[PDB]
Ligand SMILES: N[C@H](CCCP(=O)(O)O)C(=O)O
């Protein structure tokens with residue numbers, strides 16, 4: 268890895284990878300900033316390679332066409348050898364790990380609830396046993412998928428409530444869901460990743476996360492299968508974690524920058 | 526893996542692996558129950574192997590003597606070919622990753638704050654900026670080591686307050702720390718792993734976790750370097766997670782079974 272150059276696939280997603288706020292055009296890696304940009308910088312420092320950030324062209328993380336065997340997104344880019352590393356808010360999942368390899372996690376998370384502050388609602392269970400408060404998710408997102416496939420009775424009942432609701436509780440973006448909570452006066456809760464919720468609550472003091480996590484998953488760096496660099500990056504992630512550098516990066520991007 | 530018999534090394538730790546509360550004597554794997562006991566059951570069903578649970582013979586997780594280079598604990602059992610898998614509340618660490626392989630995590634955790642319910646204390650930063658509420662940790666434990674070694678200013682400040690408080694804010698057991706919170710009328714908060722906090726707050730209805738995690742870490746299954754089971758077990762853990770089986774196991778042992 269010393270004196271090598273890697274292509275890093277990523278995806279625009281706040282605050283992991285973002286276009287910098289400057290009217291002056293920026294070139295190459297310089298146009299981007301965020302937690303993932305800083306993470307690959309720290310990994311490249313420890314291991315001494317150069318890299319080039321390329322946004323994934325189809326703007327997708329990676330899903331499998333069960334019928335055709337066809338992948339899209341960042342996963343496809345690794346499998347086609349157009350990227351050496353995928354560094355993003357990319358979840359380690361069973362389906363993806365059949366096609367690519369993942370490092371140990373650099374961030375942990377789970378589905379949770381975004382709601383208004385100062386209510387009696389304390390848990391998913393308080394939502395499910397009632398009908399006045401509506402709740403939804405990003406249409407066709409990973410949170411919607413979790414509820415669709417859950418066989419935990421509480422969440423199966425919640426997906427049932429979600430699909431049976433009219434007008435529609437699903438949103439076309441997470442900023443639309445956040446607005447629906449912010450303007451809903453308690454009539455609407457939004458389901459998304461806990462990391463996304465933290466980012467929102469840092470910037471909207473009337474909003475809060477309700478309860479804990481409804482599932483447990485992680486973001487890791489994905490590599491082509493049997494990549495010769497996964498094991499070296501694993502050690503770097505654990506070192507950065509233990510030194511507190513990942514905690515600093517999270518504080519920086521969730522609480523300091525905007 | 527179909528038709529082989531694996532040795533699993535583990536360690537008594539609530540609610541991961543506990544001796545069953547029976548007066549009838551129990552043999553073999555029968556003697557044990559818990560989250561980790563149920564997890565190895567699930568993995569063995571999927572991959573089709575038999576297994577023997579053996580408690581680690583020195584009662585240790587696995588630390589490296591830097592001077593000598595000797596491993597102890599569950600890590601030693603794997604590396605001496607006396608266990609095939611280590612399945613416990615075993616943290617994935619840099620030092621261990623240099624000697625063994627780890628699966629992807631089956632559980633995520635971090636240091637957090639155990640306190641009384643319904644105060645305006647919301648974060649470690651709120652504790653650090655005041656002096657009335659004292660806070661401590663298990664003496665000699667990983668949480669205390671986390672604070673000792675931290676280079677984040679909040680936690681350096683907390684560590685300075687902890688070492689200088691009189692009477693000592695440190696405890697000989699987590700149970701002692703929990704009791705100090707419970708009986709303290711808000712005068713004491715206890716720092717420990719978020720998994721331990723959740724076990725307590727499920728059984729102590731006046732207590733809560735305050736804030737989120739001050740560090741990050743995970744438990745994973747460890748194998749000898751290059752084992753042909755790491756990658757098969759990785760897929761099992763991810764499948765169990767997504768099917769909801771790991772959520773069910775957590776409810777069972779944290780929110781349903783009390784003793785063990
Ligand atoms: N975690 C990424 C997608 C991000 C979650 P979303 O913003 O779609 O709710 C993944 O699906 O791998």
Ligand SMILES: N[C@H](CCCP(=O)(O)O)C(=O)O
Nearest residue numbers: 586614615616617666667668
């Ligand atoms: N997590 C285990 C040991 C637990 C550390 P403690 O709870 O005694 O601070 C390990 O990985 O060493």
